[PDB]
A paper describes a structure:
Optimized crystals of native TsFL routinely diffracted beyond 2.5 Å and structure was solved by SAD phasing using a platinum soaked derivative. The resulting model was refined to 2.20 Å and contained residues 1–142, 149–237 and 245–525. TsFL subunits are comprised of three structural domains: an N-terminal ATPase domain, a helical dimerization domain, and a C-terminal Toprim domain. The dimerization domain inserts between the β8 and β9 strands of the ATPase domain and consists of four helices (α1D, α2D, α3D and α4D) that form a kinked structure. α1D, α2D and α4D from each subunit directly associate in trans at the dimer interface while α3D bends back and rests on top of α4A and α5A. Together these interactions form an extensive hydrophobic network that buries 3479 Å2 of surface area and maintains the tight association between the subunits. The amphipathic α2T helix packs against a hydrophobic groove on the edge of ATPase domain formed by α6A, α7A, α8A and β11A to bury 920Å2. Despite attempts to co-crystallize with ATP analogs, only a sulfate ion deriving from the crystallization buffer was present in the TsFL active site. The sulfate binds in the position normally occupied by the β-phosphate of ATP and forms stabilizing hydrogen bonds with the main chain atoms of G31, G33 and K34 and the side chain hydroxyl of T35. Ts residues E377, D431 and D433 align with the Bp [name] metal A binding residues E400, D455, and D457 while D381, S478, E480 roughly superimpose with the Bp metal B ligands E404, T506 and E508. These residues are conserved among all Class 1 homologs and in the TsFL structure coordinate a single samarium ion from the crystallization conditions. The trans-acting catalytic side chain H283 of the Ts [name] D loop is far removed from the composite active site in this arrangement—displaced nearly 46 Å (Cα to Cα) from the respective position of its counterpart (D953) in Mj Rad50 —and would be unable to exert its functional effects efficiently. This suggests that the TsFL conformation captured in the crystal is non-productive for ATPase hydrolysis and would require additional conformational rearrangements, likely triggered by nucleotide binding, to achieve a more canonical organization of the ATPase domains.
Overcoming lysogenization defect ([name]) proteins comprise a poorly characterized family of nucleases that contain an N-terminal ATPase domain and C-terminal Topisomerase/Primase (Toprim) catalytic domain. [name] homologs are widely conserved in bacteria, archaea and some viruses and can be subdivided into two classes. Class 1 [name] homologs exist as single, isolated genes while Class 2 [name] genes always appear in tandem with a UvrD/PcrA/Rep-like helicase. Here, we present the crystal structure of a full-length Class 1 [name] nuclease from [name] (Ts) at 2.20 Å resolution.
Residue numbers in the entry:
A (entry chain A), B (entry chain A): 1 to 142, 149 to 237, 245 to 525
The structure:
Amino acid sequence: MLKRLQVKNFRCLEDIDLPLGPLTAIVGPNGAGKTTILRAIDLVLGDVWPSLRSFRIPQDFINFDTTRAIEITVHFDPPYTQGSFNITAFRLTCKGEDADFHVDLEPLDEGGNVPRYPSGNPLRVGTDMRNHARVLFLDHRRPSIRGSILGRLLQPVRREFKLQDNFKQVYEQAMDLLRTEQVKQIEKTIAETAKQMLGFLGKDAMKSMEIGFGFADPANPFNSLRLQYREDELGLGIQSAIVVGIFEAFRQLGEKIGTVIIEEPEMYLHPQAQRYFYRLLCEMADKDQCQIIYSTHSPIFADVNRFEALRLVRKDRDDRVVVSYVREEDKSALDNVRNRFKLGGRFDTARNEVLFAKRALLVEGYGDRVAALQLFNQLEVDPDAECIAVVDCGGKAGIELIVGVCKALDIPFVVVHDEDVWPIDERADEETRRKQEQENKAEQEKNQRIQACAGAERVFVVQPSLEAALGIGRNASDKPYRIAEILKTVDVGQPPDALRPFVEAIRQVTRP
Amino acid sequence: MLKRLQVKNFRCLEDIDLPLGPLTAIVGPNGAGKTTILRAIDLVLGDVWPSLRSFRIPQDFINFDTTRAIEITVHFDPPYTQGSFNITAFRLTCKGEDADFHVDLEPLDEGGNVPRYPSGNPLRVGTDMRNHARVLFLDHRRPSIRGSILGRLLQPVRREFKLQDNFKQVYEQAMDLLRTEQVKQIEKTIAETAKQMLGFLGKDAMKSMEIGFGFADPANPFNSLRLQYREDELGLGIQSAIVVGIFEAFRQLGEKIGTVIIEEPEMYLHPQAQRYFYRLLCEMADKDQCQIIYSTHSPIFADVNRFEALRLVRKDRDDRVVVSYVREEDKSALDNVRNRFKLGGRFDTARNEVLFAKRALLVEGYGDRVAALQLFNQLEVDPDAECIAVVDCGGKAGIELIVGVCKALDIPFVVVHDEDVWPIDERADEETRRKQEQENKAEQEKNQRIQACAGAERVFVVQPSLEAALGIGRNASDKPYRIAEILKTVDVGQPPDALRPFVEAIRQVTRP
Ligand SMILES: [Pt+2]
Ligand SMILES: [Pt+2]
Ligand SMILES: [Pt+2]
Ligand SMILES: [Pt+2]
Ligand SMILES: [Sm+3]
Ligand SMILES: [Sm+3]
């Protein structure tokens, strides 16, 4: 599998370095580098040998510069053994001094050096070596489909095939029904003309070449097989559905298929089908049957609970592309937080919207979101137009989790939550007093952990709780019409003292 | 045929407006707008219906702006009649206020307005209307080929086809040799999964859909036919040769095929094959059998004698794309100059290099070029590295022609030529004296015409001639070794007075 990508001076990617894992989910705004990361991988490892014909000069250089060298380095594991060399990466360079540019594909060892022979010449990247690490690229290709993707599916079929001779005779029999006299004269005009054009190259005989009409190589028929259907946004959805079916056949066939890159796996799938596809891709990645690298705009394919997969790509104040992800050092602390949330917590795909927003307001629960959005409306802010995600995190442990992801990804955020500490009723019985004390301490610990990960300047605490600030019963705590009519009597100008941290949280997350 | 293209705010094309003719040859440096012109036409008239899915937002807006509206207008002739409307152009707009963008395809009448019905609603662009003007786009697609290009070739074949029933039974017979038990289980997994993904859309039955393997629609087999060969730069050349063969079949079939756009018709063809292809494209355009619009880097496809075809595209001091061409007003004067050159003049493809250069030095003849290039070498300038074309124009009338094209195209240039006026030998006989006088006046007229079109500040005159300045005989006037050894004794520092206009011409064309 691919392990790491380095890109220098390629289109919008001035300098970038990101890890790659069994599932790599790449998110970020349009034009901010997302697709260019994928194209850089395809340049080195796609099915066209990297050469000067692979680049647009100067289109592919930063600023159309060309005094800078394009450099794409792809690292992988396990190493490729060539004789006495173990190669762990390829480095594709395109540079030049005007006006002769050139590209090199160099092999690199564990230590980042190009091995050389005792003769002193460097080791060059050969066919077997590059095909070692080749990737399937599913870009938006989506009444028929075909590609190296289906080809890889049929390669166990193409193997045990044993009726090649019979197929040739039936195939030719069918081609003869097509070869009208006019068809043959059209074919002869094409083939004779092409051969004359080729003759100018001087390479002869060359007269061994057959050029004609047909719809398959009868020797290797499974190389022209496609999926087809009878009968366009409808057509596009059908072709997306057939792709899901192809991947479902892979999973049942169990064969390892290596590295697949997908531009927007969601496209033209119903959300329910996107859920089915994502679950399928995750099973194959986790089972170690392939590696999936993709760009996505869908919160169904960008799961906050799988935070190791996340790469967030965007341009900084200076139009410099920057990639964010959970650092290795930090994975274990966030994983602990993910586990604490899984005890009693429930997962919610809607929370993944945090990954697509300019800014996030993190709240505990459904009632808090309803109240937040009504206050937005009273402050005359539309959170959808401002790309502010208001995220129901599923309680305090859930907030910790989303905070840790936002912190690791450099997503700006504000937290609001209740204090949930209550004075002890000195008249209650021993068990109630003791349990109140213990609950207060537990809540204080949860409040302190949120403060430690978010920072205090990003956290607003409603004392003792939003329910108490609103005067709202326990029954009605989540009824939107009840929350709305209470909040409609409040004055955003001077929100009550109890309610003040809630509306100030919304003012902070709104502040440009 | 397409008549005109207007592009506003699309990628690098801030504002541009160019005529389109039966042959349109688009030249200019890489990234300077050449290919973007072609892509803009394809957006409106390619085989994908223009919609919001056609654009990259913000990638396709100038500066990734999106506060500006993309506008592509394609004009054509003859008009399309829809009921009582005559449409002569389509206008594709993509704009929006964040964050909902949208695209409109509007029909336009003779006067540039969108017709509306008595109801007041505008006329919309329908299928038949847009297909009226659809273009074949041959982009770099180049062991098999296929596209709407071959499809258009076979459409007279697909017509008179009458063995559909027999073909179905032989075709299925061949598919049965492939359908192993494992193949059928793979196919059932694909089809059942795709149908389940489609079922989430709610559209039912939908159970009428057949999804399976195959290599043709047995009902319409000529829609899956391809050209193939046995067996990659060699492969790329073969596929280019097959394209030439397809166009040669078109010319023999005589059917009109409308508008074809080609990205770099030269690519992977031998120069001799490029000459064959260009001649073929010109016959079809002149015979009115199609319209060819292409970008090119080849002087074989960009003929200075066909100056009406030329469009030169480049970025000005400010990175603003500017297109140049011979204006309508000016065509008749340049055509007169082209005719005067055709009496006794000989054509030379090498002269087309003027169209690809940063600057051109225009000289009369072969001996003048040799001398120019040797002086470049003595001035320690490499004209190839500086993109200076030294152009042998074929005599003074030939210089007029190239000057007129360079002037119309805004190519910077310098002219050097001989005066060729000689004192009359008062001892000669009457006929020689009279002929000398008449030749002097003829030469003076030719010298004056060059001065009128080039401007005097761009013209250097060697008095009486370079041969006389060099002291070189008539025999040796064109022998490079003789010219070189004479020039090697000259001092670029203070070239003789007779030679001075020649070396000063070279210093001017070299001056940044
Ligand atoms: Pt980009
Ligand atoms: Pt891109
Ligand atoms: Pt461009
Ligand atoms: Pt481009
Ligand atoms: Sm609460
Ligand atoms: Sm001369």
